[PDB]
Design a binder for this molecule. Sequence first.
Ligand SMILES: [Mg+2]
Ligand SMILES: [Mg+2]
Lengths: 346, 344
Amino acid sequence: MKIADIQVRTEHFPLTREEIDNLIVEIRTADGLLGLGAASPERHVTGETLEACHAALDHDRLGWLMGRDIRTLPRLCRELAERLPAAPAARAALDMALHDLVAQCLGLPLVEILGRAHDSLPTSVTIGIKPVEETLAEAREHLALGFRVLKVKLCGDEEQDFERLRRLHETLAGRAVVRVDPNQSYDRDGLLRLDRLVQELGIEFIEQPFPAGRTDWLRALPKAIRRRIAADESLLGPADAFALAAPPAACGIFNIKLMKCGGLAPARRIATIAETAGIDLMWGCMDESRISIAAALHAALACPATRYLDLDGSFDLARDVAEGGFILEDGRLRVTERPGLGLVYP
Amino acid sequence: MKIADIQVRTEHFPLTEEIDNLIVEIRTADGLLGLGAASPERHVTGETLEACHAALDHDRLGWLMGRDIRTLPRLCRELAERLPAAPAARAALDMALHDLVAQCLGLPLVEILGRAHDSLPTSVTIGIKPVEETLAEAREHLALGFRVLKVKLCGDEEQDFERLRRLHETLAGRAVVRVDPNQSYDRDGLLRLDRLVQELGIEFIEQPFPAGRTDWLRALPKAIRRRIAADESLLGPADAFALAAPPAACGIFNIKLMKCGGLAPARRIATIAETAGIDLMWGCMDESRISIAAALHAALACPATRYLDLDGSFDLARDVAEGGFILEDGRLRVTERPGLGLVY
Ligand SMILES: [Mg+2]
Ligand SMILES: [Mg+2]
């Protein structure tokens, strides 16, 4: 099955709460199948801007891909890594469209051909940095919507962070678990205090407390604490995965985002490393169309090591370019029974 | 594509006294046939022919019946869970399933695996034996078109070193040599061997030290470690991870399907190796062309593959299949047929 055509466009998705941009990718085969992909580059984490992403997705720059056989997909992905080495979000949009196509070609949901390890998982929704009152309010809104897991961003100001966490813990009254994301904002003593609190409050783990290039700060922690820490901005691709997993392992949880690693194929390499090293998998996202969320979910549901999801990147989108691909019920995400990514597109 | 049937049988292959293989036939409902072969090596993996046979018994495979081949990664994980102590049996089933999936897609297996190579030369082996027989066998392999010789070493340095010197002189550049002491060297002896190996342009030294002795490897200078390959020390992805982790124990991983349990775990080993910058070598046991072909497809699909010792079917006086690979001028390649490309 030959790739007949590749088209990219910019989409402006207003937020329900401001807008956010995604590159939308259509790959068509000669028999008329359509694979779908979406790119949401994060320049501060990967260096990849929207301009560079868009440029790497140019139809003519992608000429090497035209006419190629999708049945060769792992070779294709190896070429995506070689020919778009600086544009991981673009790479992911193409990679996910190609997997969509291969799964449609085999007539099954993608997770089925990746091989299924899980039926569904709870996803977190995010409460950003704000005061106690707004935090508790959001918490109750989410609880009402059926969510059992909250992800709270922390700013690194301890009195405030800790207060928000205590009050949130009291309000929730065991109705949902909490996980936190300081995103690089903590120092070493501060992290020790935060971890004491986290133990106290039953918070599940701490994501990326330290600067991305600070992994030595992580390794200097007691193993019991490292096990409770997730790598996000420190983990882009398989190379990072291997360096972090190598004894002494820097942490106990890997946060994989397609827009960091560059697609499902590199994601499988990370999963291989994590699983051998006994590291749990978290699957996150940028602000994303339901297309790439769906892709991420198929991959996650196909990894035995997957323990957690922050998959909420399409929830704040006022409009999207596709429906389906995943079903949300009672705070849990699962895929549908349709082939490929299982997206409905006009 | 659903699995309709699975059959196992024991073949006794006279050499040119005898080696046994288990042959697996997997049939789907649409009439397709995948093939696999098992050659367990007990001193390496602990797996006996009896245990392998028992693991492959049709009455123990009911969980595989009716299963969809398009779900292959899931089937392979279950293979790992259900046959943890029988890697050769696991590999026979795994390669048969890969054969089937590649037929489903209508291409040579290597192509759906992502081809990274068209062909590579394979070594052929010269066993432990006196200088003259060594040289004579060397001339015999050269006349069949082989450019690479794999020489087994016994750990007696006088005999080993003289054999290698005379062989080097006799070859006069016509073939490269790699060596396999298989656990028989001590630390100092290995230093002497490495000096000689540099002198004679020998490619690398496979598994000089006991399998449980990888600390002895890590104690060596990095430049020496780079010239050493792990074999009996390397079974599956866990081993590969522990050998690759800094400081890395050696520069070359020898994957054998009868050690790691199939193409799937072989793929995991390859991921680890590529990330760590370690080269891949694909070896074998005494094996039907079926599993040689399987290994070759997998090898030609890994960017990290630098070497093959794929000669395990050459000495079989008969075999149960043809094709699956072509040997020309000492180099192995696959055919243009779908699946393993075997003629049955
Ligand atoms: Mg994060
Ligand atoms: Mg060996």
